């Protein structure tokens, strides 16, 4: 049901989010090749924590830019969930 | 602002969907090297309409499914617009 996902951050966090009207934040993509995909992030997962980061009381705005801004090399520690459905490849 | 995208389905359709509490349906990934990928669909695209059906007046599951049971060979038309939201690439 949950999973912790541990990287290093390399020159980007290796994702891309989704959400809507304040129901949560997901995963939209994991970028194939990267640290994150390795240590099982995947699309359709809501994203519960990030480092020391509530991700469901955090804007659209500030999730975005929290992910951009955590320098290279730092470890990002990703506390994801298994309001968006998401389909699998049709 | 919209885009029309025809392709002939392959095998599959080279799409993932994502969507809310009935606030549209919205391409969540479009594979890569597809017939869908070649001619121009993106993620974060709200999908108005597929073939003869409005996509913005079905439920979720007839959305997949519709998909997924077009015949291959069959040409694809797909109108979108360029209640979710999508990052780019963090």
């Given at each position: 049901?949950?999973?912790?996902?541990?990287?290093?951050?390399g020159?980007?966090?290796?994702l891309?989010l989704?959400?809507?009207?304040?129901?949560?934040?997901?995963?939209?993509?994991?970028?194939?090749?990267?640290p994150?995909?390795?240590?099982g992030?995947?699309?359709?997962?809501?994203?519960?924590?990030?480092?020391?980061?509530?991700?469901?009381?955090?804007?659209?705005?500030?999730?975005?830019?929290?992910?951009?801004?955590?320098?290279?090399?730092?470890?990002?520690?990703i506390?994801?969930?298994?309001?968006?459905?998401?389909?699998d490849?049709?």
């Open positions: 049901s949950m999973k912790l996902v541990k990287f290093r951050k020159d980007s966090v290796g891309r989704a959400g809507g009207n304040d129901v949560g934040i997901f995963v939209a993509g994991v970028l194939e090749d990267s994150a995909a390795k240590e992030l995947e699309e359709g997962d809501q994203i519960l924590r990030v480092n020391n980061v509530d991700f469901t009381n955090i804007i659209r705005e500030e999730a975005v830019l929290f992910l951009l801004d955590l320098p290279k090399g730092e470890e990002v520690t506390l994801a969930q298994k309001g968006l459905w998401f389909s490849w049709l």
